[PDB]
């Protein structure tokens, strides 16, 4: 039952953005007319016929969908399948049951989309703010109510004498091709609007020497690579010469078909819209880039190489981008599984968000087991330099070190205090994340699914499994392609090889994801690692990312580096660094439907390794995690959606000032894709010095890119090691081994850590509201300037979430940058500094300070007027793990300077993960607290929207600016009681010995500190006069 819609399959190999051509329009259909075709619920069918454009008397018919998704949240959507039947597909971001649901709800509150059909034949309907014209020929203009204005057309090319064609719906005739294209009008010259587009997950993007956030005017891809440096010689352009940078043609390692509209910005006529082609296989995104005349200055597209046709249009309920992004993640909510937590995202541990060391060349667990080989490294002693340099550290990210002889899902002796593989439990014989759990650190650990095949004629019981229940990919193809064969089998496996650099490799098979009763087996697989104390999941090489191979050629032989290239094509040999596009792998997107190669979903596989590890790794088997229940996954790659797994680093960056700006271009436009919970490697994954490729990270460098990313969602500092038995990579890279610059480096983490509810909380506004952790500062809304500020500006935290601003400076050996406050509000220098200290004056906001000077001990970092901080201290003083963090160690609503006389904040509070209570039965906390000045009284307010997790110690109030009281009344349910003046002459003696109800005055922050009861968090009126 293997293709079961006759596809003939025209292409396999890498198309690079070049090589795609819709606007072309030669052997390329186009919508030419229409007749209606009916309406049941908000599905809207036209049956349209489709002409060739450059040969009009040449047509053929197919329906097409116009489906209302969210009347309320102006989305809707346009789909056809030219290749067979429309096909709901059965895994993936958008499904039926939650765009059933949304509908479902929106009907009992009786909104009406008021889908007809004009006797013209054309098809009009509204959603809340928009509505909506389609023509004949499907010309489509969408305008908004309030000032009728034409937000989004879709674009038209005339023919010689047979009327005009819609481009807005394109096929190749499937005589040559299986693309599909959309166009639309691009006004990004246009003198009032000037369009911008934004988001395309991890595409990176060149200018002048500097790297930006806008992705406008440009030719991208969508097609998942193992792209080390994000500049993979491999992915060049036809007949490139000297070096490849990173740049926008690049496809990254996550696929999003996704580009936010943003025109006329900035002013009071502003209009976003977000646009995702929900495809799997290689996708196009072409916002006017003329290089490789792929695209036209004054038009934009999306595409793809296979079908079928299946499009999303979401405006979002109101103004500014941000709606954008929380509406598509609506799109793809869990609103219709009843989620009471988990709608938008799952909310990691809170110990997903403090600090990861990560090394790729450690070789035991303890110094005494350490193997001799030059500049080897133990666990022991990355958890010696951070521990005993008192450095808020939070465990370790182990690799494939670990495993036995690169054999997923085992370890070897060396990584065990007793040199030997324990079943665990044994407090004699403890495992790598055993001991790690006694030091207070939790791990993740490396996960591919790659399983070894050369093994010896030694056991190893998870490949011997997946022979044996046949769950492997098969060698087949409808080309009768030889993808290669070993002596160890079987005969009809797909046998892939797995190459770290310097010899580090092995042959491999590979889970057939289709099938099922694979996800159950992928799952079991993880209890042989969460009984043995693994807390969370690193997941990795999830391409899957093979070696270069040429067929023909060995299993472990890969092709002449300069290979592929245009003088020199593929010519479906080459396996682009995974699968051979050819092979025959069972249907990932419909299930029971029978089996297609995977150039047909190849930005799928990743997705699907990752929803696999979620529910039948961590979820059907949380019974065998140990120290906590709830766990997380930090994957490369993966698509659209991906966020119900857990969240993603980028990969393979390096060690250099364009890698910093990266990163952080990469952060924000992740964020509105929804994916908020990324990062990238803070120092660099890969060695940067020509010279001497050992060279480890420059001081400097390394404050710059711990500064910022010490704010970004994942923060974790990983590398490529040069040891003895590995080759390449380079010496350390360790916080610790930065003498000159310690102080700076730590205080900077202390700092995150001071602010880790405030990611926490950030992060419940993403799962609960589906709001971006990270913001473009485009998102802030009225001002013409945040725009140009957009590649190194960007705003987070707080009870809106545009509390603090950041603004990290991104050069090695700098201490300048250009500032830009964001308008009609205040803001506070902030920092890791000003926690002991008096905040300085107001910066008002609006403001432009070219050369604001910033030594390299401090990073441009502002909080707001009006904001109410989370903060969290440890009782001790000391700096410990987040998640050995306990209700006694305080939480401090540090209030800041009023805005317009008023003050806000969140709180998310819940046990940490120790289980999964939060997202199974809605035990957790939201804490609202108020403020307002009027006159000699200051009312601060504590509410709750539940209180359902019951915070166990006492916390605390800090006002900022103003000092000692006359009285400080607390209302409560359980209290009626004054505040006296405490005792204790210094915020540690408060914390430790101060009593309940004691005001401190604290002459050297400027600042009061109010002690309360933990009972009075959730209800209280603390009146200060
Ligand atoms: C560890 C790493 O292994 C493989 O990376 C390869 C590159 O694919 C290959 O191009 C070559 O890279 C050199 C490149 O050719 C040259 O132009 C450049 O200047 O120098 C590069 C090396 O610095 O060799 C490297 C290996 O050294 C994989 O393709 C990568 O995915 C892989 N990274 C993975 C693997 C691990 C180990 O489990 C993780 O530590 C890491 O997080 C993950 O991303």
């Not at 998704?69 to 039926?96: A, C, E, H, Q």
């Not at 949304?102 to 509150?109: A, F, H, K, Y």
């Not at 003329?290 to 046709?309: C, I, K, V």
């Not at 324990?422 to 399983?451: M, Y």
């Amino acid at each position: 039952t293997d293709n079961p819609d006759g596809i003939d399959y025209k292409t396999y190999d890498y198309v690079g953005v070049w090589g795609f051509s819709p606007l072309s329009n030669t052997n390329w259909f186009a919508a030419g007319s229409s007749t209606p075709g009916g309406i049941t619920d908000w599905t809207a069918t036209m049956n349209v016929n489709f002409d060739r454009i450059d040969n009009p008397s040449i047509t053929v018919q197919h329906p097409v969908q116009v489906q209302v998704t969210s009347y309320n949240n102006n989305s809707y959507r346009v789909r056809f399948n030219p290749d067979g039947p429309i096909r709901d597909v059965t895994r993936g971001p958008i499904l039926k049951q939650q765009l059933d649901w949304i509908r479902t709800q929106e009907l009992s509150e009786g909104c009406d989309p008021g889908m007809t059909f004009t006797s013209e034949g054309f098809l009009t309907f509204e959603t809340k703010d928009l509505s909506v014209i389609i023509y004949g020929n499907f010309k489509t203009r969408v305008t908004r109510k309030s000032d009728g204005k034409v937000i989004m057309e879709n674009d038209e090319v005339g023919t010689a004498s047979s009327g005009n064609k819609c481009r807005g719906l394109m096929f190749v005739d499937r005589l040559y091709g299986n693309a599909i294209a959309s166009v639309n009008k691009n006004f990004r010259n246009d003198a009032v609007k000037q369009e911008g587009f934004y988001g395309a997950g991890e595409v990176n993007c060149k200018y002048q020497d500097t790297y930006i956030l806008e992705r406008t005017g440009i030719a991208m891809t969508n097609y998942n690579y193992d792209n080390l440096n994000y500049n993979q010689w491999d992915l060049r352009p036809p007949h490139h010469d000297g070096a490849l940078n990173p740049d926008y043609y690049i496809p990254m390692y996550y696929a999003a078909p996704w580009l936010i509209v943003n025109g006329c910005a900035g002013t009071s006529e502003q209009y976003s819209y977000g646009w995702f082609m929900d495809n799997v296989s290689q996708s196009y995104m072409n916002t006017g880039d003329t290089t490789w005349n792929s695209g036209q200055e004054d038009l934009a597209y999306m595409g793809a190489q296979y079908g079928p046709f299946d499009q999303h249009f979401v405006y979002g309920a109101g103004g500014g981008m941000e709606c954008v992004v929380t509406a598509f993640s609506l799109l793809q909510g869990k609103e219709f599984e009843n989620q009471v937590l988990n709608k938008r995202s799952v909310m990691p541990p809170k110990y997903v968000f403090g600090f990861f060391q990560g090394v790729f060349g450690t070789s035991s667990l303890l110094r005494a087991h350490m193997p001799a080989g030059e500049n080897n490294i133990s666990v022991e002693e990355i958890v010696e330099g951070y521990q005993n340099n008192n450095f808020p550290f939070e465990g370790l990210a182990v690799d494939v070190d670990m495993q036995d002889n690169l054999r997923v899902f085992t370890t070897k002796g060396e990584f065990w205090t007793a040199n030997r593989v324990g079943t665990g439990g044994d407090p004699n014989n403890r495992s790598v994340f055993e001991w790690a759990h006694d030091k207070g650190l939790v791990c993740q650990t490396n996960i591919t699914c790659f399983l070894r095949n050369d093994n010896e004629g030694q056991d190893y019981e998870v490949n011997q499994t997946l022979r044996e229940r046949q769950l492997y990919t098969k060698n087949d193809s409808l080309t009768g392609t030889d993808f290669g064969m070993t002596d160890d089998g079987p005969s009809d496996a797909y046998i892939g090889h797995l190459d770290y650099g310097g010899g580090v490799e092995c042959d491999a098979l590979f889970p057939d994801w289709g099938r099922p009763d694979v996800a159950e087996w992928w799952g079991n697989n993880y209890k042989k690692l969460f009984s043995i104390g693994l807390d969370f999941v690193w997941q990795d090489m999830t391409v899957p990312a093979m070696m270069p191979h040429k067929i023909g050629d060995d299993i472990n032989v890969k092709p002449d580096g300069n290979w592929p290239n245009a003088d020199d094509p593929s010519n479906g040999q080459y396996n682009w660094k995974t699968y051979h596009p050819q092979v025959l792998v069972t249907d990932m997107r419909y299930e029971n439907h029978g089996r297609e190669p995977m150039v047909t979903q190849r930005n799928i596989h990743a997705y699907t390794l990752c929803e696999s590890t979620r529910k039948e790794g961590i979820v059907e088997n949380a019974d065998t995690l140990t120290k906590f229940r709830r766990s997380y996954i930090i994957s490369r790659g993966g698509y659209i959606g991906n966020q119900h797994f857990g969240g993603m680093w980028v990969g393979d960056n390096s060690t250099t000032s364009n890698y910093i700006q990266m990163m952080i271009a990469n952060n924000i436009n992740m964020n509105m894709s929804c994916l908020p919970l990324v990062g990238s490697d803070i120092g660099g994954f890969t060695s940067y010095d020509n010279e001497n490729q050992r060279t480890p990270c420059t001081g400097d460098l390394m404050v710059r890119y711990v500064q910022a990313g010490c704010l970004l969602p994942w923060f974790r500092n990983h590398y490529d090691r040069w040891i003895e038995s590995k080759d390449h990579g380079k010496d350390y890279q360790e916080l610790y081994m930065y003498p000159n610059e310690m102080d700076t480096l730590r205080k900077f983490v202390e700092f995150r850590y001071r602010w880790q509810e405030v990611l926490y909380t950030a992060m419940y506004q993403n799962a609960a509201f589906g709001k971006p952790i990270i913001k473009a500062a485009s998102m802030y809304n009225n001002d013409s300037n945040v725009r140009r500020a957009q590649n190194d500006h960007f705003l987070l935290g707080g009870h809106d979430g545009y509390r603090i601003l950041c603004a990290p400076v991104v050069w090695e050996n700098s201490t300048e940058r250009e500032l830009y406050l964001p308008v009609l509000t205040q803001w506070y220098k902030f920092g890791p500094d000003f926690d002991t200290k008096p905040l300085e004056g107001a910066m008002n906001g609006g403001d432009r300070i070219y050369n604001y000077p910033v030594p390299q001990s401090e990073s441009p970092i502002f909080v707001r007027e009006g904001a109410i901080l989370p903060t969290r201290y440890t009782l001790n003083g000391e700096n410990k793990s987040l998640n050995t963090y306990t209700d006694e160690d305080p939480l401090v609503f540090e209030v800041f300077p009023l805005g317009n006389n008023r003050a806000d904040g969140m709180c998310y509070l819940d046990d940490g993960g120790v289980t999964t209570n939060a997202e199974d039965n809605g035990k957790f906390s939201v804490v609202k607290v108020a403020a307002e000045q009027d006159g000699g009284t200051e009312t601060i307010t504590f509410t709750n929207d539940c209180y359902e997790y019951v915070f166990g110690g006492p916390f605390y109030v800090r006002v900022r600016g103003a000092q000692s009281p006359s009285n400080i009344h607390v209302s409560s349910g359980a209290g009626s009681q004054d505040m006296k003046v405490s005792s204790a002459t210094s915020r540690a003696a408060l914390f430790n010995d101060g009593e309940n109800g004691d005001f401190w005055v604290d002459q050297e922050t400027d600042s009061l500190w109010l002690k309360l009861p933990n009972v009075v968090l959730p209800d209280a009126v603390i009146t200060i006069t």
